[PDB]
Amino acid sequence: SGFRKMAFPSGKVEGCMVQVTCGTTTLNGLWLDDVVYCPRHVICTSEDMLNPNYEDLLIRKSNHNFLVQAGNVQLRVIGHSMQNCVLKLKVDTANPKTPKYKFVRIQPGQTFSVLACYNGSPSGVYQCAMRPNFTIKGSFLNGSCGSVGFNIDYDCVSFCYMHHMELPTGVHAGTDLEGNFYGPFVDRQTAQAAGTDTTITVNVLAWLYAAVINGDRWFLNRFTTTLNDFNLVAMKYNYEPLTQDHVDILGPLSAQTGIAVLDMCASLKELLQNGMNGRTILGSALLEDEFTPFDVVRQCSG
Amino acid sequence: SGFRKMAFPSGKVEGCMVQVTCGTTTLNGLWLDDVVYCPRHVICPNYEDLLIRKSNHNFLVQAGNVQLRVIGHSMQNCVLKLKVDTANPKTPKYKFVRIQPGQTFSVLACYNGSPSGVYQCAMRPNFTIKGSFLNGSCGSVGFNIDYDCVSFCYMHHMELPTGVHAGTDLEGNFYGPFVDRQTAQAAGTDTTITVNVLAWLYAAVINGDRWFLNRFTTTLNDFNLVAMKYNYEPLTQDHVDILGPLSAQTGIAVLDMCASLKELLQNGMNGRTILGSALLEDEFTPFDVVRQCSGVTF
Ligand SMILES: CC(=O)N1C[C@H]2C[C@@H]1CN2C(=O)C[C@@]1(C(=O)Nc2cncc3ccccc23)CCOc2ccc(Cl)cc21
Ligand SMILES: [Cl-]
């Protein structure tokens, strides 16, 4: 028993965190083998940010301009290339603490752990979901750019995100480890705004199933719904349309609890209609959308 | 900006998780130098009588794929101390500390000496923790990383019938009126950690959430009369002093913030949320808020 927002053990990622300094700018880098990955806006000044030509700025940079620091040790940059919005600094030393890793691009609704860093020193770890609007509700301060999001499935670290920018509404924007931003965001100080956010429906349903496994059944009802009828109601509450793929992904949870996916959708329709009514599902007074169907099967079984 | 339930980087603790097997029981152990620490219920109740039957080679310690050979064994309260032939090379700078209820810590959940998750939780006033544990998680540790020193403050032993957990400090002393045996054990009536709620209300102010603030102030005794009614911990003058830095950073006096909390208890959230929550959060200490809203690294 027990349901917590669980992050992956950060150990394998902490051994990768370096400090990347380029002039006055000092952010974080991910050191995997003989390459340090970091946001390309490390080369920008505060004024350049409006309309930077990174290609033009990087060509005026030499290897010894980038000061990489792995703890007290200083790494010697021997090369530099740019892949989309990330800078790839080739270094003289390969990371001995390099784990088994993959660069994965995640879809909105997928969750990951964020290892918050300041000056290449990890300060905290927490669990995040990729919001439908492609932003993350993170906990980031100045100097946290280059902090990575990952998932440790088996003994392999799947790097899925690198922090780049905090939008004016306090939410964050970043890229996959291949430098491709998530969402319609760019690495610029231009007027950018996160789109109208929505609730991750499949994730809420998965959390409602996790509650049933933990003995919470007060929200269940004698009703079922058509998939389309549920989406007409979900749309009104600012919920993501639940697709047939979502239904199939919820299959295992439906079998473990014995409550059909569209049966659990009817419970959710009623929860949206009536609210919690002073009650709490899994210690929460709100409907939680940051636990994927996979996170629930991982935490309630193994 | 941003406020999350943040745990300490588990790295220094992962390098200490071993698998302790004794007969049928397979739980986790904490390997610090040449000693593995684990719940004394792995031999499972006269624990002195049961331990004297077991020999060193009955305990099978496994550090990853490598097997550690046990060369000795002693018992400190509810914690088994297995002397091993090899000292842990990954041993960090550490202390065994005992925490007070209201203090928070990170839990590195393990199954078969393999860390699977890390999370934050608070020592509840009833001395239980609202953790996330399954079968095989006994021996999972709670810690705080201050500077570069890991302060081990908890080792998980069991789960109470209400889903809450009970465990000991690393010296084997249980937190609360709990014992390590299958018997009727119930968690006491829980209370809200008042200082922790106030600290979280300050963190909300820092994050631009100010709707709950009011023109009013109150006294420490008048607030406690109200807090007692709503099952809140009495806010002491020490709590007020500990909230000092937050009060200066936001410009809202501690008893001014107590007056805002007094109205949240009498009137509720009113359909509104503070830091994305519809309930008053009590698992962020005044120091957790100061560290997350200023950025202290390890
Ligand atoms: C300080 C400096 O000269 N620097 C320029 C580069 C290098 C250095 C910092 N830079 C930025 O630009 C970063 C920056 C940004 O969003 N930083 C932050 C990230 N997360 C949390 C924060 C919490 C508070 C304050 C800032 C945070 C500033 C805001 O504007 C943008 C617009 C786009 C993009 Cl891609 C990044 C940014
Ligand atoms: Cl995905």
Q: Tell me the DSSP string of B28-97.
A: EEEEETTEEEEEGGG----HHHHHTT--GGGSEEEETTEEEPEEEEEEETTEEEEEESS--TT--EEEE-
Atom of ligand 1 nearest to the CA of A45: 3
How many angstroms separate the CA atoms of A219 and A106, rounded?
31
**Residues A70, A73, A79, A83: what is their CA dihedral angle, to the nearest 10 degrees?**
10
Strands B70-76 and B114-122: unpaired
Is A185 a pocket residue for ligand 1 (Cβ < 6 Å)? no
Strand partners, A175: A162, A181
- CA A12 to chain B, closest CA, distance in angstroms equals 7
Backbone angles phi, psi at A2, to 5 degrees: 110, 135
**Residues A224, A225, A226, A229: what is their CA dihedral angle, to the nearest 10 degrees?**
180
CB spacing of A1 vs B159 below 8 angstroms: yes
With b meaning 16 or more CB within 10 Å and e meaning fewer, what string describes A248-274? ebbeebbeebebebbbbbbbbbebbee
Fold classification of A198-301 (topology level):
main proteinase (3clpro) structure, domain 3 (1.10.1840)
Residues of chain B contacting residue A123, judged by C-beta atoms under 8 Å apart: 9, 291, 295-298
Asked if A207 and A264 count as a contact pair (C-beta separation under 8 A), the reply is: no
**How many of the other CB atoms lie within 10 Å of CB of B173?**
12
Strand partners, B105: B121
Catalytic (active-site) positions of B: 41, 138
CA angle B207-B212-B217, nearest 5°? 115
CB spacing of A5 vs B3 below 8 angstroms: no
State the CATH architecture for B191-294.
Answer: Orthogonal Bundle (1.10)
Chain B residue closest to A165 (CA)?
B1
Which technique? X-ray
* Residue whose CB lies within 8 A of the most ligand 1 atoms, among A162, A166, A190, for a mutation test: A166
How many angstroms separate the CA atoms of B68 and A253, rounded?
39
Q: Which of B211, B282, B224 is nearest to B258 (CA)?
A: B224
Asked if B239 and B195 count as a contact pair (C-beta separation under 8 A), the reply is: yes
Q: Output the CA–CA distances (angstroms, integers) from residue A37 to A25, A67, A74, B280, in the order listed.
A: 15, 13, 16, 40
Asked if A19 and B19 count as a contact pair (C-beta separation under 8 A), the reply is: no
Supply the Cα-derived Rg of chain A in whole angstroms: 21
Residues of B (125-184) whose Cβ lies below 8 Å from A: 130-134, 159, 163-165
CA angle A12-B132-A117, nearest 5°? 35
The protein residue with its alpha carbon nearest to ligand 1, atom 17, reads A165
How many angstroms separate the CA atoms of A39 and B238, rounded?
44
Best mutation target among A115, A125, A301 (most B Cβ atoms within 10 Å) is A125
Q: Which residues, 6 or more positions from A87, have their beta carbon under 8 angstroms from its beta carbon?
A: A20, A37, A38, A39, A40, A42, A43, A58, A80, A81
Strand partners, A172: A136, A166
This structure's resolution (angstroms)?
2.5
For B1-14+93-190, which CATH superfamily applies? Trypsin-like serine proteases (2.40.10.10)
How many angstroms separate the CA atoms of A52 and B290, rounded?
35
The amino acid sitting at B149 is C
Largest CA distance in chain A: 69
How many angstroms separate the CA atoms of B234 and B239, rounded?
9
How many angstroms separate the CA atoms of B154 and B39, rounded?
11
CB spacing of B109 vs A172 below 8 angstroms: no
For residue B1 the two structure tokens come to 């900006």
How many angstroms separate the CA atoms of B30 and A299, rounded?
22
On the CB side of A76, CA atoms within 13 Å amount to 3
Q: Where are the domains of chain B?
A: 1-14+93-190, 15-92, 191-294
CB spacing of A124 vs B10 below 8 angstroms: no
With b meaning 16 or more CB within 10 Å and e meaning fewer, what string describes B67-100? ebebeebebeebbbebebeeebeebbebeebebe
**Residues B135, B139, B142, B146: what is their CA dihedral angle, to the nearest 10 degrees?**
-150
CB spacing of B292 vs A117 below 8 angstroms: no
Residue with tokens 């080679």: B57
The amino acid sitting at A122 is P
Q: Which CATH number among 3.40.30.160, 2.40.10.10, 3.30.9.10, 2.60.40.60 corresponds to the domain B15-92? A: 2.40.10.10
Chain A residue closest to B64 (CA)?
A155
The amino acid sitting at A94 is A
Q: Which CATH number among 2.40.170.20, 2.40.10.10, 3.30.420.40, 3.30.365.10 corresponds to the domain A15-99? A: 2.40.10.10
Q: Is A46 exposed, middle or buried (0-12, 13-18, 19+ CB in 10 A)?
A: exposed
Strand partners, A79: A90
With b meaning 16 or more CB within 10 Å and e meaning fewer, what string describes A105-114? ebebbbbbbb
Residue with tokens 């007290």: A72
How many angstroms separate the CA atoms of B235 and B197, rounded?
11
For residue B202 the two structure tokens come to 């300050």
Atom of ligand 1 nearest to the CA of A167: 16
- CA A118 to chain B, closest CA, distance in angstroms equals 6
Asked if B192 and B261 count as a contact pair (C-beta separation under 8 A), the reply is: no
Q: Output the CA–CA distances (angstroms, integers) from residue B44 to A9, A79, B48, B60, B159, in the order listed.
A: 30, 59, 12, 15, 16
Q: How far does chain A reach from its first CA to its final CA, in angstroms?
A: 13
Q: Output the CA–CA distances (angstroms, integers) from residue B99 to B64, B96, B123, B154, in the order listed.
A: 30, 10, 8, 8
Proximal ligand: closest to the CA of A249: 2
How many angstroms separate the CA atoms of A239 and A218, rounded?
22
How many angstroms separate the CA atoms of B71 and B89, rounded?
18
Is A187 a pocket residue for ligand 1 (Cβ < 6 Å)? yes
3 state DSSP class of A80: strand
Domain A1-14+100-197 -> CATH class = mainly beta
Supply the Cα-derived Rg of chain B in whole angstroms: 21
How many angstroms separate the CA atoms of B29 and B19, rounded?
6
Is A165 a pocket residue for ligand 1 (Cβ < 6 Å)? yes
Backbone angles phi, psi at A51, to 5 degrees: -140, 70
The amino acid sitting at B41 is H
Catalytic residue among A16, A41, A163, A172: A41
Catalytic residue among A44, A145, A160, A265: A145
Length of chain B: 298
With b meaning 16 or more CB within 10 Å and e meaning fewer, what string describes B146-169? eeeebbbbbbbbbbbeebbbbbbb
How many angstroms separate the CA atoms of A235 and A242, rounded?
10
Give, as one character, the DSSP assignment of residue A176: -
Q: Is A216 exposed, middle or buried (0-12, 13-18, 19+ CB in 10 A)?
A: middle
How many angstroms separate the CA atoms of A30 and A87, rounded?
11
The amino acid sitting at B107 is V
How many angstroms separate the CA atoms of B156 and B9, rounded?
19
Interval between CA A57 and ligand 1 midpoint (Å) = 17
CA angle A47-A53-A59, nearest 5°? 110
Is B92 an interface residue toward A (CB < 8 Å)?
no
Asked if B289 and B193 count as a contact pair (C-beta separation under 8 A), the reply is: no
3 state DSSP class of A64: helix
Strand partners, B73: B82
Q: Which residues, 6 or more positions from A25, have their beta carbon under 8 angstroms from its beta carbon?
A: A41, A42, A43, A44, A45
3 state DSSP class of A248: helix
- Catalytic residue list contains A145: yes
Comparing B1-14+93-190 with B191-294, is the CATH topology the same?
no
Q: Is B101 exposed, middle or buried (0-12, 13-18, 19+ CB in 10 A)?
A: middle
Q: Which of B14, B15, B18, B121 is nearest to B68 (CA)?
A: B18
Asked if A119 and B296 count as a contact pair (C-beta separation under 8 A), the reply is: no
3 state DSSP class of B282: coil
Give, as one character, the DSSP assignment of residue B163: S
